[PDB]
Every structure is written in structure tokens, then in C-alpha cells.
Amino acid sequence: GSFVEMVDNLRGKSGQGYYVEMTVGSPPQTLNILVDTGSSNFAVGAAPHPFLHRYYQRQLSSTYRDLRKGVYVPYTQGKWEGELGTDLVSIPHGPNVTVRANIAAITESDKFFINGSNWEGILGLAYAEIARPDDSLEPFFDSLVKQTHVPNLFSLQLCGALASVGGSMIIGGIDHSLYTGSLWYTPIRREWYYEVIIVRVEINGQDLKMDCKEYNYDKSIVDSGTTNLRLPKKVFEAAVKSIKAASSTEKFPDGFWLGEQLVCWQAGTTPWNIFPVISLYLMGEVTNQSFRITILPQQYLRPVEDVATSQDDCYKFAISQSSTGTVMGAVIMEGFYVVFDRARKRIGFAVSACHVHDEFRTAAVEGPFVTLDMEDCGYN
Ligand SMILES: C[C@@]1(c2cc(CNC3(C(F)(F)F)CC3)c(F)cc2F)CCSC(N)=N1
User: Fold this and answer.
1) Could you give all domains of the chain from N- to C-terminal order, each with its CATH number?
2) Is residue 36 annotated as part of the catalytic site, yes or no?
């Protein structure tokens, strides 16, 4: 209901992610840690990489235990390698508890840390099934719940605005001051990523009319560690086609839609109203029942601040194609208060009390709707 100590416990800079302060070891070493619902390892810089403000110094911790096992973790765009151990962990602006958790001490990386960012590790909040090297490495939140009385759920309010960003991570509950209206829940299809099922997509109220299975090819997930709304290729093609149409009073280079060039307007003259809203219908809690979440151009047209060769307002098209399914990143989550109700295997959405909107349109969460054959939307 109300967890005042945890409100506003997230920080970041635009495009560089949201982080929470944590301590690791005895005595406690403070580190800023990126909050990532799209992975399941707790991995921290443990060596003086030049990009890092600080790093985990295992030699200073009396409660450090070595698992004597390494882990090599490649991504599409980078990689880290580290040494597994366990140690005492806490969240200063979180529950008043200390737990023994797995920690991967990162000892080598490439294109992982960000030059100029203020975080030096990652907190993977997803499930053991996708932990590296395998699912016997218990994720942080699983340890937290097993070792304490913290309820098995957490919620994220990501507020957006290099400008500073902020938000809240409520550990073990929900703060009803962070949202308006009602929460609506969609089932977690499988506990690996936070996988959900999209059953309908509308641009400005007009249905895309695809076989809904396409929306979830090969999965759809909710991911605080991804900035864009990523869409499967076939779906991205139809969504762009329809967004181009709704916004055809102005024209834009093909490269802009492909995220290959920015687009700029005179400071203060961005044509929000020429861009359509985007609605995702999600599978609901009941047979044949769905609800819809709606986002604005304010969410999927993102300011790019660090353009030294321009003085105008420049923006990046932040919807993009994927070959790993739909990814509801920050473009989606910044419109909503999102509740990761692990105990009940469901994800709640409500309109965020802090989301960015204008005088004509606001983000919305609405239901119930009648949607048939929603089980056919899932990819097997
Ligand atoms: C672990 C990973 C990851 C995320 C970020 C966070 N990416 C950001 C974001 F959080 F803002 F999205 C900084 C740009 C990294 F920095 C490094 C990673 F390996 C892999 C890529 S997608 C994901 N959910 N998690």
C-alpha cells in the first residue's frame, strides 16, 4: 500500500538505463546497479575498468565466499565474463533486510559498461531458467524471498525525464500513490523472461489485422533493460506502414523509420498530434477477456540530447525490428506502473502517475474487452 522509503529510489540518465543503490560485502560496499527485468544474473564490475566509478573489491569483504567457477556471457552487442561467488547484499532504499546472494564478479567485458554512465553492475530480476551458466544459479530476487519475509513481488515506476531520469522500485509490494485508475493483470505465460501474450494491436484505434500469433513470434516480454519497443519483423513492417499513413501530413526519410537517422524540429515545434497512439491488447485474467494499454508519441519518439552537430530538437524513432520477439522496453514501461506479481504469476499495468503526456492525449489502461481465441496467439 505505501512504502515511502522506496519511492524515488531509482536514477539514471537518458538512454543509459535505470539504477538502484545496493551494498555488497562486509563491511558494505555501495554500488549503483542497473535494474533489468530482461535477465537473471546479479553481475558487478570487480576490476578497475576505466569507465567505472567504483567496483566490487572481494578482498575487502569478510563474508565473501568463492564458488570457484567462472561464467562467460555473450550478448548480441557485447559480453562479460566473471567469477562466481556469494556475499551479503542489501538495498539501502529497499526492505530492511540483508541476504546471501550469488554475485558474478565481472573481470572482463566488451561493450557492456557504458562510458559516462553512473552504474557498475546489473541486477537481473527475471527467473532462474535464463540464469547463466544454468538454472541452478539462484537469482537475487529468489534468494531475497527465500531468506526473508519479503512478499514475492516487486513493482516498477520508470519516469523518464543528458537529462536525469528517475523512478521507483517497490520491493515486496505496491504503492498506490504511483498510479491512477485500476491495475489490470495479464498472465506470465512461462517463468523464464517475464513473458506475456499480445492479442491485438491498434494504431490510432485501427486494428493491424495480423494473425495475432505474429505479435508473439517467438515471444513477447516486459524488459526494463531495453530502451525500445522492439517488434517482430513482419509486425514491425505493418506497424510502420500504418504509422507512416497516420502521419502522412509530413514526410520523413525511410532511414528515420529504420532508426538509421534522426529527425529534428525547431525547439518547441514538435508535431505530436500528427503521430498516432499505439494500443496493445494483452491477454486478461479470465477466459475470452483482454485489456488494452495505450502509449503516446511522447513515448516512442525519443529526444536525443547529445547531438553536438545540431541545435534543434532531434528525436529517434524508438520502435524497431527484432528476431527474438516483441520487447516491451522503456517505450512501454514509462507510460505505466508495472507490477511483477510473481506470487500469482501475473503482470499488472496501471496508468503511471508520472508519465509524460500533453493536453489532448494521455496514456491509458482500459478493460474489459471481449477477445476470442487468445490462446492461439502464443507461439510454440
Ligand atoms: C543483460 C542485458 C543488458 C542490458 C543493458 C541495459 N541497456 C540499456 C537500457 F537499460 F537503457 F536499456 C542501457 C541501454 C546493458 F547495459 C547491458 C546488458 F547486457 C542484455 C541486453 S537486453 C537486457 N535486457 N539485458
Assistant:
1) 18-150 (2.40.70.10), 151-380 (2.40.70.10)
2) yes
87 ligand 1 Cβ < 6 A: no
Ligand 1 close to Cβ of residue 313 (< 6 A) = no
Of the residues 36, 87, 142, 313, only one is catalytic, namely: 36
CA–CA separation, 208 and 133 (whole Å) = 40
Resolution (A): 1.8
Q: Over the range 261-277, which residues count as b (16 or more CB within 10 Å of their CB) and which as e?
A: ebbeeeeeebeeeebbb
From the list 112, 51, 48, 123, the residue with the least C-alpha distance to 80 is 112
Task: State how far the Cα of 130 lies from the Cα of 41, in Å rounded to an integer.
Answer: 9
What kind of experiment solved this structure? X-ray
40 lines ligand 1 (CB under 6 A): no
The atom of ligand 1 lying closest to the CA of 76 is: 21
**Cell reading at 167:** 523512478
Cis peptide bond prior to 50, omega within 30° of 0: no
CB of 233 within 8 A of CB of 322?
A: yes
Rounded to the nearest whole angstrom, what is the distance from the C-alpha of residue 132 to the centroid of ligand 1? 15
Cis peptide before 133 (omega within 30 of 0): yes
